[PDB]
Amino acid sequence: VTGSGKKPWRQKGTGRARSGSIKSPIWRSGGVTFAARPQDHSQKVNKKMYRGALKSILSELVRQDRLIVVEKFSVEAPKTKLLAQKLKDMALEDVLIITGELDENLFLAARNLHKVDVRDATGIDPVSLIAFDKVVMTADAVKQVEEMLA
Amino acid sequence: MYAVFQSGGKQHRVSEGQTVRLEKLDIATGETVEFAEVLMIANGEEVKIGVPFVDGGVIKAEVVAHGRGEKVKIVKFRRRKHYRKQQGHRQWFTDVKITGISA
Amino acid sequence: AVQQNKPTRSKRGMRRSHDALTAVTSLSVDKTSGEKHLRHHITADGYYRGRKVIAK
Amino acid sequence: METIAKHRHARSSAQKVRLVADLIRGKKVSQALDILTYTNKKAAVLVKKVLESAIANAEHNDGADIDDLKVTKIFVDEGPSMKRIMPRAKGRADRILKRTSHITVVVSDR
Amino acid sequence: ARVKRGVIARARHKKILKQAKGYYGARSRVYRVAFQAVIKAGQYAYRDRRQRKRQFRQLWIARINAAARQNGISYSKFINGLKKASVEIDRKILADIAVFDKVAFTALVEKAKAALA
Amino acid sequence: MKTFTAKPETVKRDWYVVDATGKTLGRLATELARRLRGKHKAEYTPHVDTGDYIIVLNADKVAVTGNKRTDKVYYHHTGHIGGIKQATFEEMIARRPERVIEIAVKGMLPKGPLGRAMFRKLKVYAGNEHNHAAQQPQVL
RNA sequence: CCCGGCGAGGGGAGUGAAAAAGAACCUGAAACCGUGUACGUACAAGCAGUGGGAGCACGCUUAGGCGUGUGACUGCGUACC
RNA sequence: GUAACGGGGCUAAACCAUGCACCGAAGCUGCGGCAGCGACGCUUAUGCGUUGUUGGGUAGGGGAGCGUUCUGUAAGCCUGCGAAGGUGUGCUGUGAGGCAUGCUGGAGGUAUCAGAAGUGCGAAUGCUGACAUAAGUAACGAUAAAGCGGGUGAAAAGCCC
Ligand SMILES: [Mg+2]
Ligand SMILES: [Mg+2]
Ligand SMILES: [Mg+2]
Ligand SMILES: [Mg+2]
Ligand SMILES: [Mg+2]
Ligand SMILES: [Mg+2]
Ligand SMILES: [Mg+2]
Ligand SMILES: [Mg+2]
Ligand SMILES: [Mg+2]
Ligand SMILES: [Mg+2]
Ligand SMILES: [Mg+2]
Ligand SMILES: [Mg+2]
Ligand SMILES: [Mg+2]
Ligand SMILES: [Mg+2]
Ligand SMILES: [Mg+2]
Ligand SMILES: [Mg+2]
Ligand SMILES: [Mg+2]
Ligand SMILES: [Mg+2]
């Protein structure tokens, strides 16, 4: 810490003592012990373990999430307002849900405190799929066998 | 008439007195089944016929009332050597009440 | 002359016994129906009966 | 407040003033002096002042002209003590706390 | 990243400091008491309740020895008479009969006196 | 219920009059010490406050068994250092049975407080019957 | 406005939702220091408690033998690291 | 200062022999309860009732947990018809602690399962701060001591004349 000095307290004598340096972990002055650090944190999951068990949604969350329709093609240039019209084709709104159309078109229109999220693309982790009530898979055909990637 | 018996300690000094005791077995709740004690009776001991035994003829027992068999009591009780301390402990029972009819 | 363990409480609270204060009790004297102080006649004029200090 | 007055600071230590206070309680009131005016200790001159101020509050906060009253309460508390230093044997034996109190006098009904 | 001991700090001291009795001086006012005294209490307690079962027995017999002997046969001979029986054995404790049912008790000393072969 | 007869704070006190003019001397102390506690007594749970009430008479008629008439350490040292220690043989002290000998019961009692309650509180004297400075009423 | 040395300090009145927010000012704990009340306590020896325990002050209940405080007397019994 | 029965006190309250009886520990038994393991009764992921047994413990090994600050679940839930915090109380758990609530309080808190720790103090002649103790004790700094009358002032031994 601001260790602007080495021990100036005279060891033997002066009555109770036994001081030393001043980045001294016991001295209220300063000095924070086993300090700390920036670190990495980021642990890395294997590749196979990454794809392992994801959309278990369909079967379990059956009566909830596993819908596939369309990416809403008729949506205006950049319009989120009347999203409700399309947010009602299933009656899934603030209930959360995310789309997986896979086209960075104008459907990235979903902007709100926290309801509908797009990310419609290969890039997507279960964490999100499980953060929403009914992840509208949609996309259509994109959901193939080994590449059911949305 | 006086009372007398053992069952988990000779607790039967008082006459009817309705004092705690032990516990049934399978469960406690109240009500009853009508359980006569046994002829531990001091002959009941109480009348012109206080008797050395208690044995003053066959069959002589009081019916158990089963007033209230619950509660506990809590007592810390913790030991500790010079390097340890089992200090942290607790063991209690409920001692069913029982009023007991007449001798 | 050092000491070693000393009990602030109780002890000392005992020596304080011989420390409480005390009460006077005196008169007023004929003229002053009050003051007179202690064994004095009166300070108002400092007179026991006349021209003593300042009076009539 | 059932007519009080109390104090704060000035400086006169606690026990010092707590001594003279014991002298006055119970009857009091009509004892605005004599049981106080005839005892000289600094603590005394201080309790009397506030004593009168208190008995004076008997014409403002409440009625009951000065003549009855009781003074059922008088207690001093330790008030923040000033700190200072004291040159001595090179600087070891020096603390000096001035100490101070109040009085808090009261006058209710018997 | 906050120990912020303050958070249980208080609760612990307060817990043991909760020695109603106050005991005396530092024994309540200062944390010093707890594991010093509140701990002793636990120790002195640990042994006394179980060691007590006998301290009363010592009294029970102390009075039986003082009651039964006045009317023939000492406590030493008493339980021996009593000892002989098919069902006749009701232990002591209630043995305090000498205080409320003297007639019973003296009628119980014969159950032993006349009993001693 | 909790069995233990209470402590009616020395409930009853049965008065008595020994003789001491006997021949048992030291032997007598026990049945004199047991008595002021809870000997003949049944109920009145001892250990706690209690006692009885008897009284000695002349007592001057004792000889003990062996040559004890001539022994018995007896000293009543005082807080005086300077080398004190007042040793006097039994016969030397038997000349005036005071707080001692007849008072052989003191060392036989629970000692300290409460036991101290019984202590000399039985009276001693040394002349039997004459002018019983003690309570004349009921005794056996 | 009132006590006071045209002090300090306070007591009212008023501001305020609150001044039990008054400038020492949020919440305000602990050590430590007091006033009041219930009980114990001035012939009794020691880690001060723990086990037993009467009495007393209040609280009990259509008694029913209890709750809270305090604890005379008594068996034990040399703190923690 | 008895001090070479613990004291008393003992002629047997000593010793030797003989036998019975009694006191006596957390030892054993009885009664209730807790936990581990083997079994028994069954039931049968499993589990519970009976039972046999095991449960002193420093270094140390192993195994389970509570609690705190922060993150997710959280503009969800709790709250000014009073949050956190402080203090009492009652119930509850084996314990770490848990909850409910009186009062204070004046604005926030966070079931749950999971995640990460500046993660839990009584000691280190530990560090900082506050308050005790001694104690209203020592001391008030050269032994060149001062007395009086006025003045002023709330008050003068000490200030002005
Ligand atoms: Mg250097
Ligand atoms: Mg030191
Ligand atoms: Mg720092
Ligand atoms: Mg990769
Ligand atoms: Mg005996
Ligand atoms: Mg003893
Ligand atoms: Mg504040
Ligand atoms: Mg007394
Ligand atoms: Mg007890
Ligand atoms: Mg036996
Ligand atoms: Mg035993
Ligand atoms: Mg173990
Ligand atoms: Mg917080
Ligand atoms: Mg430690
Ligand atoms: Mg002085
Ligand atoms: Mg001194
Ligand atoms: Mg001196
Ligand atoms: Mg000078």
JSON list of C-alpha atoms (C1' of nucleotides) in Angstrom, two decimals, chain G residues 5-6 20-21 26-33 79-81, chain H residues 84-87 104-106 122-123 129-133 154:
[
{"chain": "G", "resi": 5, "resn": "G", "atom": "C1'", "xyz": [-23.72, 37.59, 34.03]},
{"chain": "G", "resi": 6, "resn": "C", "atom": "C1'", "xyz": [-27.70, 41.76, 27.86]},
{"chain": "G", "resi": 20, "resn": "A", "atom": "C1'", "xyz": [-38.12, 11.38, 20.87]},
{"chain": "G", "resi": 21, "resn": "A", "atom": "C1'", "xyz": [-34.69, 15.80, 13.36]},
{"chain": "G", "resi": 26, "resn": "C", "atom": "C1'", "xyz": [-30.17, 9.98, 10.50]},
{"chain": "G", "resi": 27, "resn": "U", "atom": "C1'", "xyz": [-30.17, 5.02, 12.79]},
{"chain": "G", "resi": 28, "resn": "G", "atom": "C1'", "xyz": [-27.91, 5.29, 17.46]},
{"chain": "G", "resi": 29, "resn": "A", "atom": "C1'", "xyz": [-25.40, -0.67, 19.98]},
{"chain": "G", "resi": 30, "resn": "A", "atom": "C1'", "xyz": [-21.31, -2.02, 23.58]},
{"chain": "G", "resi": 31, "resn": "A", "atom": "C1'", "xyz": [-17.77, -0.52, 27.55]},
{"chain": "G", "resi": 32, "resn": "C", "atom": "C1'", "xyz": [-18.40, 2.91, 31.07]},
{"chain": "G", "resi": 33, "resn": "C", "atom": "C1'", "xyz": [-21.63, 6.39, 34.62]},
{"chain": "G", "resi": 79, "resn": "A", "atom": "C1'", "xyz": [-10.68, -18.54, 35.74]},
{"chain": "G", "resi": 80, "resn": "C", "atom": "C1'", "xyz": [-9.57, -18.89, 30.12]},
{"chain": "G", "resi": 81, "resn": "C", "atom": "C1'", "xyz": [-5.11, -19.28, 26.90]},
{"chain": "H", "resi": 84, "resn": "A", "atom": "C1'", "xyz": [-32.40, -2.83, 6.77]},
{"chain": "H", "resi": 85, "resn": "G", "atom": "C1'", "xyz": [-30.25, -1.92, 11.74]},
{"chain": "H", "resi": 86, "resn": "G", "atom": "C1'", "xyz": [-31.04, -1.65, 17.48]},
{"chain": "H", "resi": 87, "resn": "U", "atom": "C1'", "xyz": [-33.61, -3.90, 21.48]},
{"chain": "H", "resi": 104, "resn": "U", "atom": "C1'", "xyz": [-37.64, 1.69, 18.35]},
{"chain": "H", "resi": 105, "resn": "G", "atom": "C1'", "xyz": [-36.64, 3.03, 13.43]},
{"chain": "H", "resi": 106, "resn": "G", "atom": "C1'", "xyz": [-36.75, 5.76, 8.75]},
{"chain": "H", "resi": 122, "resn": "G", "atom": "C1'", "xyz": [-11.02, -13.78, 23.14]},
{"chain": "H", "resi": 123, "resn": "A", "atom": "C1'", "xyz": [-6.25, -13.81, 23.36]},
{"chain": "H", "resi": 129, "resn": "G", "atom": "C1'", "xyz": [-11.03, 4.65, 18.87]},
{"chain": "H", "resi": 130, "resn": "A", "atom": "C1'", "xyz": [-14.04, 5.19, 23.34]},
{"chain": "H", "resi": 131, "resn": "C", "atom": "C1'", "xyz": [-14.43, 4.51, 28.49]},
{"chain": "H", "resi": 132, "resn": "A", "atom": "C1'", "xyz": [-12.67, 2.67, 33.27]},
{"chain": "H", "resi": 133, "resn": "U", "atom": "C1'", "xyz": [-8.78, 1.90, 37.60]},
{"chain": "H", "resi": 154, "resn": "A", "atom": "C1'", "xyz": [-22.96, 38.47, 39.05]}
]
